[PDB]
Amino acid sequence: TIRNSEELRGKAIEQLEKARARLKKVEMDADQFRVNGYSEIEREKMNLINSTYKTLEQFEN
Amino acid sequence: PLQTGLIAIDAMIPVGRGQRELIIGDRQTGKTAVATDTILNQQGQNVICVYVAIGQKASSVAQVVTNFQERGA
Numbered sequence: 001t002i003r004n005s006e007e008l009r010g011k012a013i014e015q016l017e018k019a020r021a022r023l024k025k026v027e028m029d030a031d032q033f034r035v036n037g038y039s040e041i042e043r044e045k046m047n048l049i050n051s052t053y054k055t056l057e058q059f060e061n
Numbered sequence: 062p063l064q065t066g067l068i069a070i071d072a073m074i075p076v077g078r079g080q081r082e083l084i085i086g087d088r089q090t091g092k093t094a095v096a097t098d099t100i101l102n103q104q105g106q107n108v109i110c111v112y113v114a115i116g117q118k119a120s121s122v123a124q125v126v127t128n129f130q131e132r133g134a
């Protein structure tokens with residue numbers, strides 16, 4: 001009986017802590033992903049405007 | 062190779078330079094879109110494209126030309 005509860009508690013805490021550590025890491029991945037996405041969106045917006053200005057100029061031609 | 066950018070064509074029905082592939086379908090089945098896509102896709106492949114529009118509606122031909130122009134094709 002003693003060897004069981006301890007193992008459960010050992011294993012259990014290794015697992016809660018591990019799960020929350022993973023949460024942190026993701027909190028990290030997402031955090032990273034959000035920054036990348038934001039930059040990509042800005043560039044894409046830039047894409048649209050730039051290319052449409054090119055299209056304008058061609059229309060003027 | 063003559064690339065269409067259509068994975069269904071360029072994997073299973075490949076079209077090569079000097080070839081004649083027919084695009085056959087019903088009305089409004091997507092035939093023009095496939096052909097037009099091919100011409101739009103030769104943007105930097107250094108080929109010349111001709112689009113003969115036999116008997117096609119004047120507005121429709123104009124629409125195709127406008128689409129090509131917007132793309133820079």
Ligand SMILES: Nc1ncnc2c1ncn2[C@@H]1O[C@H](COP(=O)(O)OP(=O)(O)OP(=O)(O)O)[C@@H](O)[C@H]1O
Pocket residue numbers: 086087088089090091092093094095
């Ligand atoms: N890969 C595709 N994905 C989504 N829609 C498509 C695709 N290819 C064609 N279409 C749509 O199908 C519609 C009819 O296509 P399209 O006019 O190109 O075919 P069509 O056979 O030339 O018709 P028509 O007989 O009127 O000339 C178009 O509005 C087009 O947007």
Ligand SMILES: [Mg+2]
Pocket residue numbers: 092093094
């Ligand atoms: Mg058509």
